[PDB]
Amino acid sequence: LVPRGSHMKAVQYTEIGSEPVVVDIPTPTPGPGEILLKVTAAGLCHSDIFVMDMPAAQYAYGLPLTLGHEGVGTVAELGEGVTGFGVGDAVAVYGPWGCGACHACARGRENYCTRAADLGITPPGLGSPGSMAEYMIVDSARHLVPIGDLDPVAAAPLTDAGLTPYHAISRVLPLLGPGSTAVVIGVGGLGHVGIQILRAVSAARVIAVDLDDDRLALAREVGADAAVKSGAGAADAIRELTGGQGATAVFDFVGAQSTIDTAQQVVAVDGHISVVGIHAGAHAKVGFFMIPFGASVVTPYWGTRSELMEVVALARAGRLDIHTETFTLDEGPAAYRRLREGSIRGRGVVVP
Amino acid sequence: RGSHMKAVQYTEIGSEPVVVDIPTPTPGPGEILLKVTAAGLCHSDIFVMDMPAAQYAYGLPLTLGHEGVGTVAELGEGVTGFGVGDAVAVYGPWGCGACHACARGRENYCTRAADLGITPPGLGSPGSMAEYMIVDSARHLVPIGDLDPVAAAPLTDAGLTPYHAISRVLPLLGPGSTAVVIGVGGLGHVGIQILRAVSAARVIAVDLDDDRLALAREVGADAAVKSGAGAADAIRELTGGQGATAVFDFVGAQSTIDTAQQVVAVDGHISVVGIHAGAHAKVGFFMIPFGASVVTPYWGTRSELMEVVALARAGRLDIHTETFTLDEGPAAYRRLREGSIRGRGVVVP
Amino acid sequence: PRGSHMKAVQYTEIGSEPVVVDIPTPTPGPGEILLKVTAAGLCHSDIFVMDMPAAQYAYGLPLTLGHEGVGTVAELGEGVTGFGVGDAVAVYGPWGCGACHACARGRENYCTRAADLGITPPGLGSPGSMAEYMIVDSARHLVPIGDLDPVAAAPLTDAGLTPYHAISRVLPLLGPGSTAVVIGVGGLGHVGIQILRAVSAARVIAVDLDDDRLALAREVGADAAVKSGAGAADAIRELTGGQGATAVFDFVGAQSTIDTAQQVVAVDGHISVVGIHAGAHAKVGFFMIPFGASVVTPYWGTRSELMEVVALARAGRLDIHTETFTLDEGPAAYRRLREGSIRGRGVVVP
Amino acid sequence: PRGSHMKAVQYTEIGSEPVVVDIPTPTPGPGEILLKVTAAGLCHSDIFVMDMPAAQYAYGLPLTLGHEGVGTVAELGEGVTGFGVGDAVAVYGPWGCGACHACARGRENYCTRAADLGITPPGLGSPGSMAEYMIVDSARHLVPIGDLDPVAAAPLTDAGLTPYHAISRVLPLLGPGSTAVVIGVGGLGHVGIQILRAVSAARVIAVDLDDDRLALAREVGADAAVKSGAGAADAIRELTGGQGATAVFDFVGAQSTIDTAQQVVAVDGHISVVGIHAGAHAKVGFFMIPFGASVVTPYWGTRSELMEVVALARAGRLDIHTETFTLDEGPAAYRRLREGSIRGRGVVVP
Ligand SMILES: NC(=O)C1=CN(Cc2ccc(CO)cc2)C=CC1
Ligand SMILES: NC(=O)C1=CN(Cc2ccc(CO)cc2)C=CC1
Ligand SMILES: NC(=O)C1=CN(Cc2ccc(CO)cc2)C=CC1
Ligand SMILES: [Zn+2]
Ligand SMILES: [Zn+2]
Ligand SMILES: [Zn+2]
Ligand SMILES: [Zn+2]
Ligand SMILES: [Zn+2]
Ligand SMILES: [Zn+2]
Ligand SMILES: [Zn+2]
Ligand SMILES: [Zn+2]
């Protein structure tokens, strides 16, 4: 698609319960401190679905909403006083914006900003204009990470399919020494990247759990030491491979009550369960004799800027091979339909 | 406001700081202009001002003061998250904001800051010892609210710097550990209070001056020791001859560093905090216990600065301050030289 | 220096969408004027003609769209005086022969020879204004707009002129104590409500489906607002104490709406069917419409009226909302129009 | 070559879809060269052959697909000198006998003996490039690419070469002041424009179906762009002062486009029919086409041509939009190929 003036194509969620639609909205202009990006790739994500399935009550993200919370692009116009990027610069968009000033933000951890709810700072494509348009605004230089000559299509999923699993893993990386076992439940958009991250940054043994045969082989293709079929037999299968020793960490990318249950029955004493996937209602039960002593559970949120940099560094060293399928802006809504039915293999990416 | 303002500047190499009149700055996009409420002095200012002409490229004239507190006076274009009137402490060690270190909150260790020419206020950029001051970014301001400006000033250095040193190794300082603090004047005095507040470690003070030792007692040091060749053996006796987990040397002379190496425990840590040009630890087999790490730490982090204020706000830190006026700036530096300042000096415009 | 060719938004094939295409920059023959287009409005009419089926097509293609044109004088043809280069002019849409009785009376839009001679308007038969340059046939089709913003002027050549002429036809009836009912507070109706407040002292009643438009109507001078549909007739009658309405300006033109009109018009009143819905018509017969109630489908407006619309605008008395598009985005603007998500009138700026 | 088995995509049964397979790794005979495939492009032509029916089937499957092949030399067959193991080479597609008069003139694509000798192109009868490794028959059929990205080079072997040949056939006619009409700005047409810009001073006019396609034409160096359809002949002539275009490269190849072409082509000009549509053909007779305007259906490209295409590429003068797939997504890509849901050219990277 060619740049053609004062408006741009965007993929907007317009009405609750409706499908998203392509619209020609005005191209924004960066205020002072803001940056305008020419979007070069915008990732689709299952999360996008969840948000679009909230009822009139639940949903508090305001309409219309340009979707797309995984976004990379080139610098188009710098707002007033923004130095430290030049027009043409390829950047990835750091997703979970924060106040930049509370204790958490001051330590890098914006994803856990203690203020961004109050101040109404929301991420692009999840409350602020997202990346699935020809252009987007980013509030602050602080939320741009350089990516150099990385391919945008492969870069885009890094902002979430890379960052989110990286963070979860990172939370307990000291535990994942040689000898340790990491269980990755689900080999979807996130699972298949988590596996690679586990290999690149740790020496843990990785055991993948999914339903389809071709998923298990995908798991093997990307570095999973072993692969087992998810379901009521998955716990025993894992205990089998672990010699009954139980796994150091379980990263549940699926996040169903099924999988969380498995995770609780395989997790090692003094291990960790990280519930990364959203299924409304699904929850671990952490109480004496319902989970091993010392086994900590958490639901992590996205990742940190230093993480996002670290993820880009992995990709730029050829350590991450994200599986993509390219779409057009126009194909935007059609891509969503593809996602609901779970036929997109790997991660879908829109390319203006 | 006004067209110009007073400022304590270092104008030529090897001269005294003089109060001169210079344009009142105006904040560009991204900047904040503060009405300064407190500007601190320390020996660091004296150090920089004793660099010879020979070692000199650029810098002059310089507005001094890297220990700055003020209130927001005007917001540059775009700047949000502060309102005019806000009481703020200036974070000293500025960084690029975008490298790995800066993204982790460790701007004191910004790897791009040399090459980009980002110098701290009063050490390369305009300092806090003037009527007004520019801060480059909102992210260099830390709220203090209620806290008295004059108490806040020294925290930005005298507080931050020991805090960071101790923070690097605080995991080691659990119940039963021993911290040695060499030099209990400026940074060490705050150092003991920090150690008392964030740790259960046994604190041993070491100094040359006898009454300094007694005062160090008052702020929570568990034993006193007199610097010198006796110091090592005395400390060992106090630690039942098992060595000290951590030695924070705030003097930083060869003598003290030598003491440090002779008292540090196996797998311990030595923080060389005080600068004496040339002086250094000798880290190598059979010259320091196995596993005993040594570092020259630099200033502190934003997180840390916040934690410092929090400590102060809760009444856990107390530095004695002596107040000067902005005109008395040069007169204050003079007093610092002859060591006739009890506690830290603070200029109040 | 203009270049041999220029971009133009054109309807190239029946059922297709508008495309930005390259075509020769024209030069003015004797009597013609060339304008550098400064603004060009779209409206639903563009959509209507674009929806004519193949069955019906005979000639016309390709067609540079845009009957709502504003420009500045670029080059004058041989023999043309009365306009200088640089002059900002709006283009009079419904071109006529100039020599029949209706033309001579200053009612070109009702020219009796225009069809026989194949005099078609720009954007609907002749090259329209949705290009970098455009040709106007006579100086008599240019109307000075002074320093009025071209973007503000563009919609007036239709959204302004059309409801003006429809109201003008029956303006003497609309003295103090009269009631005008405006059906359709979309494009034309929004401007029409403004016209009624400026040129008359009638009481204006807005009628529309969408409540958001009903509020918008009030802010522009609507004395009262009623929701379209079966309830509307009774509801209007309520607001007039049963006495009907002097004049009903139907901007929608739907059978249902014309039907409401016939039930609410006063005796010796008037109904102006201004919107087009193929086949929708009034039924003017005994006991099926009040005595003396006259019905008409007006067509656009006269040059005199257009000057008057400009003067209203320049005096601050007409405030139509515009969203600007660039020439390259022409088709973009048409799809927004087609899915009806343009607040007010869209205007294209070469 | 390590690994006795390798992955590949193949056409295994008539009318059915290509499927992923595990076949033995080939070993280069005397005079053959074995490549490790760095990139294997797709194109519509692959569909065309898979679409031919059962009835019109004689002798030639399973078939490793892929006629756009790039690789590094893995192992050198007996006596083969001229390349080092590790050398990045593109596979020239139209294999010829190498000994007929055409072949001795560089023009191997028009070899008069290759059909009589069943010499078929790689992936169109011979083992294709779409696998981990492939066999090339002769060093004559490798062209070095140096440090050019394989993903970029692969399309060049067809989307580059084919237009390039077409254009070259008549390049002496494309002097300053000539006009070249490119019909269709899809894969080939896009690259055709950029070639015309590098190698000639001809003025280029693009014709296409879609508003985006026309803007893209303009972006890649078209001086003008008009919409295909009944109107497209006159559209062009308007741009050319009614003079007609010296050359017309129809990359679409519909009867309608060839018809357009016959109406725009200049006297003593040329029409190059470069796209396949079963049945579509020019009508070269008196009064059906200007005197001296020649027509041809060119076939692919010559070896020295591929080399020149690579030189353009290496000097940043040839842009080609690529989308990467994996060997397993091969069949997936071929589906997307059918729905014309792929921008530019698809490339498979093992
Ligand atoms: N931290 C996580 O598990 C997820 C982070 N995101 C962005 C997002 C943010 C908020 C929601 C609603 O929960 C969902 C998705 C992407 C994958 C899962
Ligand atoms: N150990 C440290 O980093 C300290 C921080 N400062 C500011 C500073 C830093 C560096 C210099 C160089 O002379 C001076 C002054 C004050 C005491 C020591
Ligand atoms: N006009 C040409 O020469 C073409 C060359 N190719 C390869 C090809 C094409 C068609 C066939 C017959 O189906 C065979 C091989 C790609 C595009 C056009
Ligand atoms: Zn996502
Ligand atoms: Zn925050
Ligand atoms: Zn200091
Ligand atoms: Zn930095
Ligand atoms: Zn109109
Ligand atoms: Zn007439
Ligand atoms: Zn091909
Ligand atoms: Zn031959």
Q: Residue by residue, what is the 3-state secondary structure of chain A?
A: CCCCCCEEEEEEECCCCCCCEEEEEECCCCCECCEEEEEEEEECCHHHHHHHCCCCCCCCCCCCEECCCEEEEEEEEECECCCCCCCCCEEEECCCCCCCCCHHHHCCCHHHCCCCCCCCCCCECCCECCCCECEEEECCHHHEEECCCCCHHHHHHHHCCCHHHHHHHHCCHHHCCCCCEEEEECCCCCHHHHHHHHHHHCCCEEEEEECCHHHHHHHHHHCCCEEEECCCCHHHHHHHHCCCCCEEEEEECCCCHHHHHHHHHHEEEEEEEEECCCCCCCCCCCCECCECCCCEEECCCCCCHHHHHHHHHHHHCCCCCCCEEEECCCCHHHHHHHHHCCCCCCEEEECC
- Ligand number nearest CA of B154 is 6
Closest partner residue to D238 (CB to CB) among C19, C24, C328 is C24
Residues of D in contact with C27 (CB under 8 A): none
Residue closest by Cα to atom 4 of ligand 3: D300
A106 at the B interface (CB within 8 A)? yes
Residues of D in contact with C331 (CB under 8 A): 211
Angle between helices B302-313 and B160-167 (to 10 degrees): 110
Query: Where do runs of H (alpha helix) occur along chain B?
Result: 43-49, 100-103, 113-116, 149-154, 160-167, 186-198, 210-219, 231-238, 254-263, 302-313, 329-337
A160 lines ligand 1 (CB under 6 A): yes
In chain A, which residue's Cα lies nearest the Cα of C325? A6
CA distance A154 to A150: 7
CA distances from B292 to B169, B171, B254, B261, D124 (A): 11, 14, 18, 9, 71
D57 lines ligand 3 (CB under 6 A): no
Which single residue is written with the structure tokens 């089937």? D57
Find the Cα–Cα–Cα–Cα dihedral A206, A207, A210, A214, rounded to 10°. Answer: 70
Resolution in angstroms comes to 3.0
Closest partner residue to A328 (CB to CB) among D219, D326, D343 is D343
B45 lines ligand 2 (CB under 6 A): no
Q: Please tell me the number of Cα atoms within 13 Å of C277 on its side-chain side.
A: 14
D340 at the A interface (CB within 8 A)? no
Q: Mark yes or no for CB contact B76/A81 under 8 Å.
A: yes
Counting one residue from chain A and one from chain D, the pairs whose CB atoms sit within 8 A come to 19
Compute the nearest-CA separation of C3 from chain D (Å): 11
Tokens of D37: 């495939």
Which single residue is written with the structure tokens 């005298």? B158
B297 lines ligand 2 (CB under 6 A): yes
Contact predicate B225/B202, CB 8 Å? no
Tokens of D103: 């072949």
Q: Mark yes or no for CB contact A323/D326 under 8 Å.
A: yes
Could you tell me how many residues make up chain B? Answer: 349
Helix, strand, or coil (residue C255): helix
Could you tell me how many residues make up chain C? Answer: 350
B160 - beta bridge partners?
A: none
- Ligand number nearest CA of C158 is 8
Residue A344 Cα to ligand 1 midpoint, Å, equals 19
Query: Residue C87: CB partners within 8 Å, gap ≥ 6?
Result: C72, C73, C142, C144
Q: Which of A2, A150, A151, A214 to mutate to test the interface with D (most CBs of D within 10 A)?
A: A2
CA distance D95 to D103: 10
C20 at the D interface (CB within 8 A)? yes
DSSP state, B109?
A: G
In chain C, which residue's Cα lies nearest the Cα of A23? C336
Which single residue is written with the structure tokens 């072997």? D157
Tokens of A275: 């519930």
Helix, strand, or coil (residue C157): helix
- Ligand number nearest CA of B66 is 6
DSSP state, B81?
A: S
Contact predicate B287/B261, CB 8 Å? yes
Rg, Å, chain A Cα set:
20
Residues of D in contact with A351 (CB under 8 A): 343
Compute the nearest-CA separation of A124 from chain B (Å): 19
C76 - beta bridge partners?
A: C33
A5 at the C interface (CB within 8 A)? yes
Residue C94 Cα to ligand 9 midpoint, Å, equals 11
CA distance A128 to A120: 10
Residues of A in contact with B76 (CB under 8 A): 81
Which single residue is written with the structure tokens 């609901």? A340
Query: Residue C180: CB partners within 8 Å, gap ≥ 6?
Result: C167, C174, C196, C200, C202, C203, C204, C205, C245, C246, C247, C248, C249
Which single residue is written with the structure tokens 């049945």? D279
Contact predicate C37/C133, CB 8 Å? yes
A300 lines ligand 1 (CB under 6 A): yes
Atom of ligand 2 nearest to the CA of B42: 16
On the question of a cis peptide bond just before residue C121, with omega within 30 degrees of 0, the verdict is no
